[PDB]
Write a protein that binds this ligand. Sequence first.
Ligand SMILES: [Mg+2]
Ligand SMILES: [Mg+2]
Ligand SMILES: [Mg+2]
Ligand SMILES: [Mg+2]
Lengths: 427, 427, 427, 427
Amino acid sequence: ASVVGTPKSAEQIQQEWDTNPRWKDVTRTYSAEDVVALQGSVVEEHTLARRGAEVLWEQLHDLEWVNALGALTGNMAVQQVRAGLKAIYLSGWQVAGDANLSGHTYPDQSLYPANSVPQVVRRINNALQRADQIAKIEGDTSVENWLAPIVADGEAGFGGALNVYELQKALIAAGVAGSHWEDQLASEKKSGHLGGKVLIPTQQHIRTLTSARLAADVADVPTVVIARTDAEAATLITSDVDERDQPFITGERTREGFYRTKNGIEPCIARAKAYAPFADLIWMETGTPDLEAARQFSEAVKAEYPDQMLAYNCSPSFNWKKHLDDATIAKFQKELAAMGFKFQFITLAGFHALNYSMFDLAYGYAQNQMSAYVELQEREFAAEERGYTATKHQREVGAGYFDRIATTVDPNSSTTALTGSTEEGQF
Amino acid sequence: ASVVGTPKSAEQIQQEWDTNPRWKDVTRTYSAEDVVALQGSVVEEHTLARRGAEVLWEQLHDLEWVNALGALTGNMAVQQVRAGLKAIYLSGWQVAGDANLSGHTYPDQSLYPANSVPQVVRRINNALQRADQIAKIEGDTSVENWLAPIVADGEAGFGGALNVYELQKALIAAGVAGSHWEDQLASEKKSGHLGGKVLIPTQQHIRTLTSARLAADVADVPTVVIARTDAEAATLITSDVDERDQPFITGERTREGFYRTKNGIEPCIARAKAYAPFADLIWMETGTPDLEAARQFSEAVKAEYPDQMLAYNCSPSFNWKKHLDDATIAKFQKELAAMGFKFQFITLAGFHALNYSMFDLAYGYAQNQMSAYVELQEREFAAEERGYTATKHQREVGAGYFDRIATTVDPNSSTTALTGSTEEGQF
Amino acid sequence: ASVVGTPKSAEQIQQEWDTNPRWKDVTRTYSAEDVVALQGSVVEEHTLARRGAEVLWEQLHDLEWVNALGALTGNMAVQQVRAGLKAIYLSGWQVAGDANLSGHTYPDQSLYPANSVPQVVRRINNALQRADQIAKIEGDTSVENWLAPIVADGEAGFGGALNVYELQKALIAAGVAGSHWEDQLASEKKSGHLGGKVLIPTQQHIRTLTSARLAADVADVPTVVIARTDAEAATLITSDVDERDQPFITGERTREGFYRTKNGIEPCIARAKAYAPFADLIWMETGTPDLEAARQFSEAVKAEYPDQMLAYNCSPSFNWKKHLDDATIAKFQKELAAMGFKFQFITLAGFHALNYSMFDLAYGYAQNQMSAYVELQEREFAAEERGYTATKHQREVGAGYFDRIATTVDPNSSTTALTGSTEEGQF
Amino acid sequence: ASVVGTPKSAEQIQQEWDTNPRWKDVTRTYSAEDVVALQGSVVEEHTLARRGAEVLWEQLHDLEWVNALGALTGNMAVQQVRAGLKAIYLSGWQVAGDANLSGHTYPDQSLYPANSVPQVVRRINNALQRADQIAKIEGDTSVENWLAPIVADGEAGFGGALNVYELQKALIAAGVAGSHWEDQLASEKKSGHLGGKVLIPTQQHIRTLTSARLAADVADVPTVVIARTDAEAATLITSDVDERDQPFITGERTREGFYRTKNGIEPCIARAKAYAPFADLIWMETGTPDLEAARQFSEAVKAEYPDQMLAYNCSPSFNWKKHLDDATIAKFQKELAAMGFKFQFITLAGFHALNYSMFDLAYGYAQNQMSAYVELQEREFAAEERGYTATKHQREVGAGYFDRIATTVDPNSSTTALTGSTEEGQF
Ligand SMILES: [Mg+2]
Ligand SMILES: [Mg+2]
Ligand SMILES: [Mg+2]
Ligand SMILES: [Mg+2]
């Protein structure tokens, strides 16, 4: 007997849908009653998911554009926010390669356990929460919002609409702000820039986008839903059942029973228009960093959905200087923003920053031992004027915060950490 | 009914102890019969734990000295090996800060779930095996041994001798090559360079080393056992029961009941000698990077144990250029090796390399967007002449390997990944 | 920039502590300001933990007494509730034996990973939530509250005050209603009815209780804190520092440095009184089910703290019929309730029901194959008149629920589960 | 530089395939060189997987038949072996319902994380290893082989051939003896006795079986591979690309693009013959327990493959007494064995034993408190004459085993468990 967590009435839900500007362009093919019927008698409050999704939605409208870097560890996200970024991108590619629950290194093909990204989302939020806590006790107002919104990779759902539903639900439980879903066959999922991609029917992805929204509704949070299409390079599709896809079907079939389909921007535009009512943002994977191709896509889509916001993947899978000059590179994101691409991210930033920095250090260490490390430590000290604080690793990880907890429990405790530490007397 | 995994006889074990040089200076207060009684009727083979211990032991004798860098992710270890390092250091500090099973960020005080380091060991080995697999299909002989031995942090055991036993056993099952254990009170465990450290009786740590050895023997592998003392800065000890510790006891007690003790190199020397018979390597934590203090410790210990190998923590908790000139820094590790310090490691190398590189990239990204990232990419392309291979992230993470698996299952498969990928056409 | 999760002011918190009857007899040695200082700028809502603690507190006052059985799996808790129980006990013993994150079977000695119980708490709540969801779609009002409050085993905290804090915080995040803590040395933690137990100083356990409370306050939920003392059988204590323990210290020391101490009800009474101000419930481990011993403890404690509610462990570690007659056995709990024992539980109920039920079936199966199983099924069908529902396992595990989700996403889905199932046409 | 784990040469592998009777009827569409190319330079030994597979294979030939019950917890498997069973069945249904890594309760539709079953296989082997260890120190020869082979559910692979490969590998790493794979679309996977099942092309499942074999070969263990067909009830198939399936295709298509197909024993027989060369055992799901249908299937298959062994699911999804009489029920398994069904199992034995047993105890407990539990304890005492040993829960879970470890580390330890325990003085 308790009123804690009591579900909202179908009427209240309906009202929010009809009045909140958040749902201005959102179409739901199910009823408010349907949502309530799935909430049981208790609805858990998902604080981080709600706040994150609200902050993300706001930033997408108030800022020229929202950009982010892929993070595969908690500390990565902390450094990103400490450096001034206002969003965190959680790459599935990076999770596959260096942060998934199987413990194995995998290429980007939906090989890892379906709850891996959810765990990293939870992990990133914990890391940001610790930074937040530490900033409070240090009186550090350097960062206005440590709990930056997280946009996580839902890939192809790892199966059908039910798998999609459970993933969205888990991402929310972990505190995610937004999630993206691609129109690829889950069992043959390929990285956006790897070959051998197989698309699924247009309607099937709409079911995916619908299931993703339903989980969010049942969890009572305004999670930002992003639809991604891989039709730009995919030359295969699982079925010709959907009339909207038929125009592109060549008729040829593979041993596996797939159908050949004409790839390119035309299919992406069609699918994007079909997903628009079910997506807060739309993303088109491309084979190169091309502002003109992006313009073409944006204009064609906005021609039918003026307010449709877009997302763009500034992929490390591109050999940037091989395609663009420094001038264009420097204005790349600003131009995309000018064309409606409000969420931009470098998917594999973390994988590259982590692998390079360690290769570089290890190499130098192999040749000059301590000298190579001291150079890094000195760069860290030097970056302190830019706001860097990890040089003092103890406090950076909460040594001061836990000392506070220790002294709160027992002020006369003789086992506190920072007092007498080398960090206190050498940094 | 099978002979697979049939345990060795006590006699066979005894002969190994009596005739294998590996055990030349190893004291065991239990018997071969005791080991057998604990093995049940089936003994699991631990391939990576055996190979790693064998390789590690060998390198400790054939090389001028073995150095390593702390790694907290699989890719980290891969880069370390790719760069030439022949050993991997698994820091418990880094695990607490950014890689433990609780999902939280913690200061180095044994706050995380006890099976966290074992998981990282398993993860590191998996990552190294993938690199190994990839190198084989790429005909890459750049690296002689991808499976570098892993030396992991056992901290203070997370409890009693039984907790120690389970941790060692879990580390072995994951493929660890060596593990270190410190003489601190588990419940008040502190980072070597944090204050408020509490020592446990000398005999208690001997029970710990004995327990670590027993686990290794029952798992039938020659795991390298490292003994660590924190008596250099620790001014508290749990009890005065051990006569060997009494000389340092002042008589004063804290409100918790701890005994004040006189810290310094003197207590470290006494404990080191007491641990020697139960340690393959001995490590003394220090408050500064001082070669003279190190000599003092080494000469004192070797005076009674000439063949006793030592390990040294070239800790990032030291402000290096504040204590030494570049000349000393440059020869630091070489000088230590000349004094018997055969295993040297930079504990928090991973934390700092990861935190700094992401802050650097994120900061520049916040100001110039793409230009900041392109700079990293170009440094990566340039680093290839040094042997760096992660620029091509797809193959680096196994895309080529799984393609091989796919074409092995079905050579006519129309869903391979690398063929038609941007990496193939742009790198 | 969001108001979601904004922390309460120190004033608001202080007011709650001064006016809410919940805190009537609760002593807090820290201030509201200390709590606020640890909450960062965002406080996550813990719906289940809040509701659960409120319900548990109310039940302890409205019911003659609250009883429960140990549950180690989700389905177990579901059946317990389905059967009419209004509380779930989560035994640490059972987790060690058949449900901890190391995957190993362990005796009750704090050998498993410290986040094991929290994970089981989360699991039990998920199971109850599924049942709640199913009941709602089946219009089943059989159970008033599927979300029964969970009382979990915190054992000895797995270390110091900080480990205690993290465990309580984790239990709360998983949705626990109450948690218990014992005054034993974590590193030598023993099951209540095993020998070799080592107590810690009275004041140290008060620190544990204080830390457990602090964690709940920072988490902003009225978690029920339970204090357990093992002084009935323990003959050892870590230190003689505390003046409240000295009367029982005999002066003798063991080789490990522990002090011999006189066990019995007298030390338990002394400790219970000392813990009273920091415990919503006090529990004393006993070596036999004795109503007179229980009365002795209850009256002595209530003499100074009239409103102090107690908890009692009706342990399977007792050979019940060897100590009591059926008449006493039948009135046992009712009697304890009359004496202030408002929370009673059979710790190892799950372990025994599971191990016995499977041995019995397996044994019979090995002799009469299918006949043995048919007997079980028939007993299940029979149990349906009593309220049993697992006979139809498909709906019991949510098949009907996910069909609802499936049809909400796509009404014309041709892949629903129950339609055309053998359960639908054979049950 | 070590020879430990050195891979076998292709020649050695080829010889085994040509000479070992284990591979007598095994068709491999890839070469020995292909296997070697994927093993890198180190092959980990999988003791439990090898021993288990070997034992299982042997028992499948030397016994009239091998039967098992579904196990979802370690203790469950232990009691099954204690009772005399010589194999353990690991149901995916039970894992989804009460033992998967998501912590949620799910119907049987491949909703849980892909590495869930592997974790349970590891858990089950750990539990059995403890029982083996305990038995050794107790001088208990009651059980000849505690390490009974485990047959695990690989379901539909959780994706494509690569997902299948990873699952098999993980199962093998965990120590599985055999694994089964079904010809259902993973993204729509349904319990064998639930409706809405979609089959995949015949050739596709052959790729699955081939991938499962390849994974075992690379892992260098003779894993028993089981092929399962769901064509008996499935009225849908993803594609009509395979000519072996077209005879059953009706021509109609669903909105999702699925093809209607004619279900029955006929499609099962055809698929079984096609899988034969790639399966050590073949299993067809049935809607009812029918000995004649089983004969029909068995004879038709053995007509072309005389040595092809079969597996049968004595499913709890059948209302046994509603279909058969006690006479048939009693001979059922013996009959099936007489027809080539060498591996028989009751899939949901653990779910029902666990759910019923707890409901029964909880119900009585809710009514008569302690009286209800004493009844169970008394039954447990009585069962001791049949071999039951869990009554003494302390030793059952290894308290005596760890006491052995403790006294081995320190024979003078004053903190042993069994001495002074109530189990010792009351049982
Ligand atoms: Mg991705
Ligand atoms: Mg450490
Ligand atoms: Mg307990
Ligand atoms: Mg199954």
